[PDB]
Amino acid sequence: RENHPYFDKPFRNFCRVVVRARFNASKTDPVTGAVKNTKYHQLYDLLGLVTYLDWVMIIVTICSCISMMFESPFRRVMHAPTLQIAEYVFVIFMSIELNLKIMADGLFFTPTAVIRDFGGVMDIFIYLVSLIFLCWMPQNVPAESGAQLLMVLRCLRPLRIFKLVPQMRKVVRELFSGFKEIFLVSILLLTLMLVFASFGVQLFAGKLAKCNDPNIIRREDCNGIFRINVSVSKNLNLKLRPGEKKPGFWVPRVWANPRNFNFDNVGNAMLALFEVLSLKGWVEVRDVIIHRVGPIHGIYIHVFVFLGCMIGLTLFVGVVIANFNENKGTAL
């Protein structure tokens, strides 16, 4: 209560009445007042797990989402009178609750405040961004400057539903409960990532390139416009007539690496390893490294994924079920 000269920043009655509106969860009889073994309880419990002002904040967030669902790149927000009521009402009712909060007690110097972790700081950061996006209004911004980092944090909205709902608050406490445990597990997965990225850049550097047209085999001859067929249907197994050619068109010959993956630098080899770390899209790269660079090279990727997806993915899904025994109460 002491050690603050700027304490209780500017009556002190009205806001504290309207914020601690303690609505009853279970209405009782006027005789004894016991627990409720009756049918109609889940509606009145869904009604009142928060306050009424917090109910209006949850309602305006959900209606802003379902109105802001029909955003599109050619259906704008900042130009028309129809959709600006989201930003207006959102900013104005945030200013109402925040003026109520700073008139009431303060910002952080009180222990009654919500700010001990993510909640208060994330509220005030979303409010700074939304205040300076209601005031800015540019009608032409390109993809070249970093103020759109602002505009990519403009839609991090539902990390605030995790603040007001206590159940959502406790499951996002669970969601960062083992975040240090899985930081160490991510260090182990990063060491596997680093050793195979070093393996990739230690053997395969610049070797995955070859002629796009299979027939030609030498780079000296890698010049001209060859004829490339175009994929029609993978699943059909139609047999081509003897005197007919598959659809295609004429394209230049190039000695180019595959787009999705390559192992020349540590970053793109790390991207290849990461993309095979989810266990999908992998027989393409397996048959590439068997077909083209050697029959002795793909077995290293075989033993790597046989160690990775069975000792790192399983260490993930095991230390988290161990942590779910810890926090939901089946540990000791």
Partner: protein, 243 residues
């Protein structure tokens, strides 16, 4: 009765039309089977009390199935359109849904499903809401996509209901690689942008490296096993064999 409820469900072998001359005598045969069934249900409700027939779940569910079957029979003989056979397919599905009264172990695993679906109000709406917000962030930068076979006209970055469906695809773990590798579009594969990120179509080079790991490494490795653990904690409590 346990073999008759399986002999009723095998008449859905053919997609039901109004031209196939072998599904109308089998429709008449299933009309005779539902007549035998409603005869047995009437003798069962004259066998025991209607009050205990109302207090129990499976009895009044079967009574609802027989009422929908008899109104199906009288409306097929009154209207003769395809909507009669559609609601007949619906009551046949409700008849196959009346499998509850004979086995004990499948019920324990449907009760496992029931407490999976009722109790888990936590992380299903978390996943829906995060795929919704990531749909918004796909709109606020990556909203105009170049086309391939992956990014087709069926799930692209245009509308955020359609981008709910794109996220809803990318969370499933299959081929999110060349999904992410359809929109990293930089010169010399792009038009020179000066003042506007909407008029032209462009892709990020390093903000996508930030963004798609920021989406995938935090939920799309650890929260599906939390749903697995939901089915685990519904399993060890309700399932039992001989002890």
């Amino acid at each position: 009765i346990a073999l008759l409820v399986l002999a009723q469900s095998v008449l859905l072998s053919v997609k039901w039309d109004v031209e196939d001359p072998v599904t109308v005598p089998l429709a008449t045969m299933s009309v005779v089977f539902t007549f035998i069934f409603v005869l047995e249900v009437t003798m069962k409700i004259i066998a025991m009390s209607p009050a205990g027939f109302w207090q129990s779940r499976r009895n009044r569910y079967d009574l609802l199935v027989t009422s929908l079957g008899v109104v199906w029979v009288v409306l097929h003989f009154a209207l003769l359109n395809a909507y009669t056979y559609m609601m007949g397919a619906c009551v046949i599905v409700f008849r196959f849904f009346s499998i509850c009264g004979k086995h004990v172990t499948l019920k324990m695993l449907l009760l496992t499903v029931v407490v999976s679906m009722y109790k888990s109000f936590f992380i299903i709406v978390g996943m829906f809401l995060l795929l919704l917000c990531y749909a918004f962030a796909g709109v606020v930068l990556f909203g105009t996509v170049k086309y391939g076979e992956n990014i087709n006209r069926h799930a692209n970055f245009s509308s955020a209901g359609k981008a709910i469906t794109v996220l809803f695809r990318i969370v499933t773990g299959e081929d999110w690689n060349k999904i992410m590798h359809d929109c990293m579009v930089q010169p010399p594969f792009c038009t020179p942008d000066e003042f506007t990120y909407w008029a032209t179509d462009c892709g990020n080079y390093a903000g996508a490296l930030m963004y798609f790991c920021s989406f995938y490494v935090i939920i799309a490795y650890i929260m599906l096993n939390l749903l697995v653990a939901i089915i685990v904690e519904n399993f060890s409590l309700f399932y039992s064999t001989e002890e």
